[PDB]
Design a protein. Structure first.
Ligand SMILES: Nc1ncnc2c1ncn2[C@@H]1O[C@H](COP(=O)(O)OP(=O)(O)OP(=O)(O)O)[C@@H](O)[C@H]1O
Ligand SMILES: Nc1ncnc2c1ncn2[C@@H]1O[C@H](COP(=O)(O)OP(=O)(O)O)[C@@H](O)[C@H]1O
Ligand SMILES: Nc1ncnc2c1ncn2[C@@H]1O[C@H](COP(=O)(O)OP(=O)(O)O)[C@@H](O)[C@H]1O
Ligand SMILES: [Mg+2]
Ligand SMILES: [Mg+2]
Ligand SMILES: [Mg+2]
Lengths: 512, 460, 173, 458
């Protein structure tokens, strides 16, 4: 037996008049304050998801509409509020600045500039919560987005309009891979968005300083929800980034959006749910945490030209728009059977698994190709890369099948010894240094060198120097071929001839 | 008139209170004007006096307390019949393909009782699918159920596309595709592939997409079932494709957690084994017609033992397990011949010919597994003259199980091949008898029928 | 037990009655409303799952002894929350709040045999100094004590019974 | 003006008039017998009720006591006058000296500095500890965390860092003892005072004797003092003796505050409680805070929510382990789990970086062999895997060092090893130029020359 916000003076009011004299349904009064949740009494006409306006310039989102209470979460510092403050229900839902002028700015979850470079020049506002494009409005994804990593572009292609999860343990290069995927777009025509959930501000400062060393910051938006900000903002942060990315998609341009640790958005939402007393499921997560990420990631889409023409009212014709997502997840001790990883692995179109046993042994990026998947597959590759990467899957597959013998390798036969020592070389080939991305011509050239047997003589200790020398050789001598591959991605018997000649002349007349 | 009023809204769960004369029944459908739009709610529980707890079949945002709610005095009911062929519909039977109204004569409620054990009939007519490995290693009869088990990226969805294409083109049978928790990218690729292959006019589609609330994703299996039942009453033999049972069970778990039921074994609802039976028990062949079913089932983290795949096993008649290792060596359909199984694979039903061919193939592959690890150490020349023969024939058999699909042409440009069961048995039985010991291995790779291996050997 | 959920309603009803001077009418109104809750046929209804407004209107009908606006409004507010069974406790806490506001007390005096009516005067006079309140004695006779007297005033007791002395000595040893 | 109405453990409920109710985080005062007790309000419930935590022993509180509303948060002395003195959580002086002659008092609840104000500094900071500044070097103004179970050496390491940095450093320094032994606070206070560095160190103690309110709020007091020194334009050292006790004290209080439990019984607000602290301890354009934080790991489980949510807030993470300390190898740092933001070729130079990566590579390859070594014995190893095992064990020994503060435990005198002198030694061991020495030649020595010498004497 416990009370439900029936208290002395409210009851007395009702004693004197049970049928409340008609009173504004557009306002109510705070009756409770705790941990960022306020209980409001009144607000007969409040709608779920509505924005409620508090003294000062602050807002709350109405999430629980109960029998004579509205549970709302304060978007900002709440400790100032107090029982009895009056509050009004705006008719509105949350909206965020949207425009082309956000590129290069750092903005918080409400689009307020946080870098101090002065106000924004946006292009109007967009609702943070929106429905994704329908089934009939899509178009099949058949364009590559290049990360500049041999291991990812060869064996786990990402296509414009895809949703590729990056998942691994702590400190394995999850953020590194995504920020190299961003830096590599500086001259690709894809606008990037990096939204950081629950990180400490001095990490964001550092990634922005690295994005600005390289020329990438002029072409990317940063949305920050630091670890000190209230849960409502950390939980709504990804949707503001999606609402800023959908500006480009819906106008026939391409965007790329990186949600950094959705596994922290899930935690902020768990906090909000447990403070509103909602029934906990597994690991105390609320029931609907799948519907949380699902309706977020289903906004990444490629939309056909008819949808663009309808949306821009004929102003843009003949161009498809796209939005690509790379949500990041953190698994404790490599458990992919926890509640949050179990959902996002089921929503997305692919998975990049980063492993710490590989990261320590020096294989960086630590991509694990045996368990990584891309469902779009070769449809998102340039046909030169699609042709050449097909031999790497088989090389590494036979290697994974023979790897168990590495410890008895002395007793093996020379037939399988050659496969076992080829897999090691094509594995040592996929290692790569940070912030050093490769154009598709360089990747194709190196994967060609590996597939066609050229590296068989080179000792395992020299593959890195071999590659490093080969790239400089080709750069000084054969710039006109690289300039052709990088621009067409095409593959021919003529192209194969030219490449075979390059490799012969290099391996005969150079040294590494 | 509209007799009810909303009294709570908490996420997707809405409480509505009616006068106690006219409380809706369970599973009834209500209707409310969510702004400039219409929203239907499905009653889950009659709790307390006049109050009813419901699940919203749509976005809950914009709902106020006190809105007027009207009860449609019948469950959710969807269009059925020939009118639905070639259309895409959501859980409520509304078209999501922009081709306009459905044109249906008749509407059926999606909640109905399964056939009684005496209305059934057991007939052992094998389906012919046109895929070598499936027809040979995992035969399944009309009215039975097949489960495509495997991890992610192995081929469940393109295997189902291929089965649909074959059934629709080579046997002119109708089909229904229920996309329980469907990724819109794959749903659109499926729509364009069915319409390009010119089979759309014999499939009817139902999509509960991932971005929809749990209630939509849960009830879609029953809408697909109801359409397949309408086709059965007409005396047809239909085929029902469920795109993932795993997401049916997940939608059930979410719906359970929202209604506050006390959870169970690993966070799954308590009613898991009852929901699975409510679904799987309406799929049967009755004396008037037949529903066959093939069902993709994701196994999370390769363990086959957590409740979601563990419970479904009780209902399947055949299981085809797909492996990413096999797929990575490039031999699609990526079916493992040793672990796939069928209850119909016994001589009394498939004849001694098919049975002996199947067991002989499994035995040769099982022996090649043994010899692999001697070949690795001792090298191959230490094998007998007979064992080198088992090796060459096992490698040929292992190539021959691969096949080029008509729907995979978009991935590789290669044209598809349909292989009858006679050709399958004849080809494998020939290979195992040394009839083709003179051809090279690669002559059998992605070659379709056996007579096309001899053609390909001339060109190699 | 409704001791904790009765407190708000008791305080609200007492404040309202105080403002309008009708404390003595409100106490009678609450006494009758609590009496209708003990009835065999009504205590069955209150347990049913009737809707609040229907339960209130069928409960209001059984009482014409309630001042039509406010006494019924209290019933309606309580029925909304499903607390009509708390009336027999709202009544007692209303009586307590009244006794506090009118600075009155009611002390039990337990004795082995009745006192001389001159003793009682002294006891009451002394208590009215122990307490700011005007006392009302209700003496009683108990044979377990056998000399002296027990004075119990609320939850404070002053024990001068010989029985207490014996059983307090036995523990010293 | 208020009345107490409930007392559950450490949380107290107080009832105020409808219009006089305190604000969140205000401080109230009660007279608990012949004592004055301070309550800090956490929540406003309906009806003028307000729920609080007692900054003191809760025993002896009756219901109905009168509590006085002080209209301000908890405020602590701050600035130069708080220097060389021990203080309570409430800012009261706790050594037997006189009152603190402070000019100014600050509220312990503050907002973290704006993103616009932060600053970034690659200036490497040398510590004479081989493993820490080979594997996980840290920078002036950065955060360091020492992760470890119970009894593995994350306080000895912190005292050696104090020795190597905080005596050789000019600016002020702050030490917050959150929920740790009072014996060690006394030992530290006297070690300071008996070497005259005390008058540049400010101390705050909330040790494990004290009820949950003190251990809960004592970290914010140390942070407030450090932030005052930062805003004056100085650069400061802040050492926190166990930050895990700041959240455990929240778990203790959480259920009484009426909040549903979360993953392993933790409060639902764990990540926010931790972030709103860890976010104000940072350097900025006006001045810098360099910090070292000891982070206890319960049940040695590094995937527990409380350690797991902390790794994201640190720049250098040094992970100590029991399976190494029980070999006698101190400091028991795990090099396959320690890490630093600063370990880049562009920050430490190609040679330091390359040595560190080679050391990780060898030790990892050695981990991979332990199962086959355990089953089949060491003789089945390839002729070059035996060499990997020998160099890995030599590297495991050479990572050990004698500290100056651990003389009391082992007699042997301390050693200081410079960075230039350790990358040279590890490059040597890896390149094979010491393969002729025995393993024990490397255990508990300074630079590599002392190993080459110890080998003569066996
Ligand atoms: N290709 C690479 N080569 C060498 N080092 C790398 C590479 N990629 C990442 N690293 C290093 O690994 C360390 C961890 O990387 P990163 O921070 O990207 O992982 P993370 O998962 O984001 O860590 P956190 O758990 O803090 O998010 C960084 O110091 C980075 O310098
Ligand atoms: N028979 C096949 N031919 C060519 N590619 C295939 C085939 N089967 C699967 N794939 C590849 O696998 C990817 C996803 O297959 P799919 O069946 O959707 O996996 P899942 O079973 O996880 O849904 C496709 O994009 C395709 O590239
Ligand atoms: N360098 C060292 N040499 C010898 N013993 C050490 C060294 N470092 C730590 N220890 C041992 O570690 C034990 C654990 O002490 P301590 O560091 O206080 O653990 P905790 O970190 O839990 O406080 C000490 O009793 C001490 O013997
Ligand atoms: Mg990161
Ligand atoms: Mg699929
Ligand atoms: Mg300690």
């Amino acid at each position: 037996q416990l009370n439900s916000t029936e208290i002395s003076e409210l009851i007395k009011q009702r004693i004197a008049q049970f049928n409340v004299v008609s009173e504004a349904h557009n306002e109510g009064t705070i009756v409770s304050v705790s941990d960022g949740v306020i209980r409001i009494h009144g607000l007969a006409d409040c709608m779920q998801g509505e924005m409620i306006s508090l003294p000062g310039n602050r807002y709350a989102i109405a999430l629980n509409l109960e029998r004579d209470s509205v549970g709302a979460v304060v978007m900002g510092p709440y400790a100032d509020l107090a029982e009895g403050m009056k509050v009004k229900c705006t008719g509105r839902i949350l909206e965020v600045p949207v425009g082309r002028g956000l590129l290069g700015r750092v903005v918080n979850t409400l689009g307020a500039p946080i870098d101090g470079k002065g106000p924004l020049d946006h292009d109007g506002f967009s609702a943070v919560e929106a429905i994704a494009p329908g089934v009939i409005e899509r178009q099949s994804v058949d364009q590559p987005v290049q990360t500049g990593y041999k291991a990812v572009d060869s064996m786990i292609p990402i296509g414009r309009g895809q949703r590729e999860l990056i998942i691994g343990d702590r400190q394995t290069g999850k953020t590194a891979l995504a920020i190299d995927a961003i830096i590599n777009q500086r001259d690709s025509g894809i606008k990037c968005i990096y939204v950081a959930i629950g990180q400490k501000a001095s990490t964001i400062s550092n990634v922005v300083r690295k994005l600005e060393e390289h020329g990438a910051l002029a072409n990317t938006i940063v949305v920050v929800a630091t670890a000190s900000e209230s849960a409502a903002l950390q939980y709504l942060a990804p949707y503001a980034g999606c609402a800023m990315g959908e500006y480009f998609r819906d106008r026939g341009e391409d965007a790329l959006i990186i949600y950094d640790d959705l596994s922290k958005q899930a935690v902020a939402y768990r906090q909000i749910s447990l403070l509103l007393r909602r029934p906990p499921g597994r690991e105390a997560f609320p029931g609907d945490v799948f519907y949380l990420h699902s309706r977020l990631l289903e906004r990444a889409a490629r939309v056909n030209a008819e949808y663009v023409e309808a949306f821009t009212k004929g102003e843009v014709k003949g161009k498809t728009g796209s939005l690509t997502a790379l949500p990041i997840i953190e698994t404790q001790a490599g458990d992919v059977s926890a509640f949050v990883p179990t959902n996002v692995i089921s929503i997305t179109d692919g998975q990049i698994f980063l492993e710490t046993n590989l990261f320590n042994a020096g294989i960086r990026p630590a991509v694990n190709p045996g368990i990584s998947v891309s469902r779009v597959g070769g449809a998102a590759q340039t046909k030169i890369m699609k042709k050449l990467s097909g031999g790497i899957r088989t090389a590494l597959a036979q290697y994974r099948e023979l790897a168990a013998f590495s410890q008895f390798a002395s007793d093996l036969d020379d037939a399988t010894r050659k496969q076992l020592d080829h897999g090691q070389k094509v594995t040592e080939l996929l290692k790569q240094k940070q912030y050093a991305p490769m154009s598709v011509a360089q990747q194709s050239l190196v994967l060609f060198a590996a597939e066609r047997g050229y590296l068989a003589d080179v000792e395992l200790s020299k593959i890195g120097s071999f590659e490093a020398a080969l790239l400089a050789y080709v750069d000084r001598d054969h710039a006109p071929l690289m300039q052709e591959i990088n621009q067409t991605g095409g593959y021919n018997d003529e192209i194969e001839g030219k490449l075979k000649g390059i490799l012969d002349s290099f391996k005969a007349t150079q040294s590494w | 008139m509209a007799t009810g009023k909303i009294v709570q809204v908490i996420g997707a769960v809405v409480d509505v209170e009616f006068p106690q004369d006219a409380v809706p029944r369970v599973y009834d459908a209500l209707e409310v004007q969510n702004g400039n739009e219409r929203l239907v709610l499905e009653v889950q529980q009659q709790l307390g006096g006049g109050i009813v707890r419901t699940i919203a079949m749509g976005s809950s945002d914009g709902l106020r307390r006190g809105l007027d709610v009207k009860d449609l005095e019948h469950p959710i009911e969807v269009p059925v019949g020939k009118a639905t062929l070639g259309r895409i519909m959501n859980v409520l039977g509304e078209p999501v393909d922009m081709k306009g109204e459905i044109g249906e004569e008749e509407r059926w409620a999606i909640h109905r009782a399964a056939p009684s054990y005496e209305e059934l009939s057991n007939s052992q007519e094998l389906l012919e699918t046109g895929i070598k490995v499936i027809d040979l290693m995992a035969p399944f009869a009309k009215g039975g159920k097949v489960g495509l088990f495997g991890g992610a990226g192995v081929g469940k969805t393109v295997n189902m596309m291929e089965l649909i294409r074959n059934i629709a083109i080579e046997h002119s049978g109708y089909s229904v595709f229920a996309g329980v928790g469907e990724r819109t990218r794959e749903g659109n690729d499926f729509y364009h592939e069915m319409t390009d292959s010119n089979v759309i006019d014999k499939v009817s589609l139902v999509y509960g997409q991932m971005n929809e609330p749990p209630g939509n994703r849960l009830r879609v299996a029953l809408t697909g079932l109801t359409m397949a039942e309408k086709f059965r009453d007409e005396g047809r033999d239909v085929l029902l494709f469920v795109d993932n049972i795993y997401r049916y069970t997940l939608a059930g778990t979410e719906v359970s957690a929202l209604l506050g039921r006390m959870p169970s074994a690993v966070g799954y609802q308590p009613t898991l084994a009852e929901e699975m039976g409510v679904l799987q028990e309406r799929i049967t062949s009755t004396k008037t017609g037949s529903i066959t079913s093939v069902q993709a089932v994701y196994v999370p983290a390769d363990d086959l033992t957590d409740p979601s795949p563990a419970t479904t096993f009780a209902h399947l008649d055949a299981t085809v397990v797909l492996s990413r290792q096999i797929a990575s060596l490039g031999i699609y359909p990526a079916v493992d011949p040793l672990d796939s199984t069928s209850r119909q694979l016994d001589p009394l039903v498939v004849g001694q010919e098919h049975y002996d061919t199947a067991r002989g193939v499994q035995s040769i592959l099982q022996r090649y597994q043994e010899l692999k690890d001697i070949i690795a150490i001792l090298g191959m020349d230490e094998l007998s003259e007979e064992d080198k023969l088992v090796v060459a024939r096992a490698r040929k058999i292992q190539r021959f199980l691969s096949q080029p699909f008509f729907v995979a042409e978009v991935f590789t440009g290669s044209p598809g091949k349909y292989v009858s069961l006679k050709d399958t048995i004849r080809g494998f039985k020939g290979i195992m008898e040394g009839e083709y010991d003179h051809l090279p291995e690669q002559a059998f790779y992605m070659v379709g029928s056996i007579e096309e291996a001899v053609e390909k050997a001339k060109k190699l | 037990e409704f001791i904790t959920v009765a407190r708000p309603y008791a305080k609200a009803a007492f404040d309202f009655a105080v403002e309008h001077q009708s404390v003595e009418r409100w106490q009678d109104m609450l006494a009758f409303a609590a009496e209708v809750t003990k009835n065999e046929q009504m205590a069955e209804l209150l347990s049913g799952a009737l809707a609040p407004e229907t339960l209130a209107e069928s409960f209001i009908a059984v009482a014409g002894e309630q001042l039509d606006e406010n006494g019924q409004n209290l019933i309606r507010v309580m029925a909304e929350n499903g607390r009509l069974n708390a009336l027999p406790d709202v009544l007692e806490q209303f009586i307590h709040l009244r006794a506090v506001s009118e600075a009155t007390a009611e002390v039990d005096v337990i004795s082995a045999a009745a006192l001389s009516e001159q003793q009682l005067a002294k006891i009451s006079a002394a208590m009215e100094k122990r307490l700011s309140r005007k006392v009302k004695l209700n003496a009683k006779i108990d044979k377990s004590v056998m000399a002296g007297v027990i004075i119990r005033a609320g939850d404070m007791v002053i024990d001068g019974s010989v029985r207490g002395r014996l059983e307090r000595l036995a523990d010293v040893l």
